[PDB]
Design a protein around this ligand. Structure first.
Ligand SMILES: CCCCCCCCCCCCCCCC(=O)O
Length: 134
């Protein structure tokens, strides 16, 4: 399964344009100040057809579980209540969130052994680079 290469624990080492991405979502200044300065850990697990993606940080934790291709309800780290779907498109794990007539896509792919997360909302595009910890 293509998901096997994503499994494990990943730690943020680099970020580009995250503040702009949060601004585009309406995250307030005080939260952006802290969120831009944290280095989250993302844990990706799979048991049968169910994938679980956990994001851990010193001040906020999220967890979602899903089957690929099946829409699910998600409450995001910034408290948006969204409709989500995740597909594995070739080698790219593509997570689409929809709410209030808006969308944002979170694409994860493996480049040179690192996990690259690209977040797009409107024209705000952010790249988050994660190194494999375990
Ligand atoms: C995940 C770090 C703390 C997040 C605090 C809430 C404000 C920003 C949330 C924006 C949507 C989720 C972004 C995830 C980024 C990532 O996984 O590197």
């Amino acid at each position: 399964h293509m998901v096997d290469a994503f499994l494990g624990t990943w730690k943020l080492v680099d970020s580009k344009n995250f503040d702009d991405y949060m601004k585009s979502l309406g995250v307030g200044f005080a939260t952006r100040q802290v969120a831009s300065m944290t280095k989250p850990t993302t844990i990706i697990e799979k048991n049968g057809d169910i994938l679980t993606l956990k994001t851990h940080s010193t001040f906020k934790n999220t967890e979602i579980s899903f089957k690929l291709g099946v829409e699910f309800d998600e409450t995001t780290a910034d408290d948006r209540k969204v409709k989500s779907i995740v597909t594995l498109d070739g080698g790219k794990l593509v997570h689409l969130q929809k709410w209030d007539g808006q969308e944002t896509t979170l694409v994860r792919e493996l480049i040179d052994g690192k996990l690259i997360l690209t977040l797009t909302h409107g024209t705000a595009v952010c790249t988050r680079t994660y190194e494999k910890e375990a």
